[PDB]
Design a protein around this ligand. Structure first.
Ligand SMILES: [Zn+2]
Ligand SMILES: [Zn+2]
Length: 63
């Protein structure tokens, strides 16, 4: 930024408020956010498993 003290900085960073998507299963950032008919999204690494174990319908923890 811009302050009297040259070389160092007070400590303020401007940014915009936004929302982040995380997998409620593995609790980690999902590279590719795949939105399910349920509404929420998940990580392929996770969806892939559920899809197999369950072929008929899909169960969601958030829902
Ligand atoms: Zn996951
Ligand atoms: Zn859901």
């Amino acid at each position: 930024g811009s302050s009297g003290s040259s070389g160092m900085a007070s400590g303020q960073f401007v940014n915009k408020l936004q929302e982040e998507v995380i997998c409620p299963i593995c609790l980690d950032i999902l590279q590719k956010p795949v939105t399910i008919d349920c509404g929420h999204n998940f990580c392929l690494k996770c969806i892939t498993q559920i899809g197999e174990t369950s072929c008929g319908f899909f169960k969601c923890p958030l829902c």
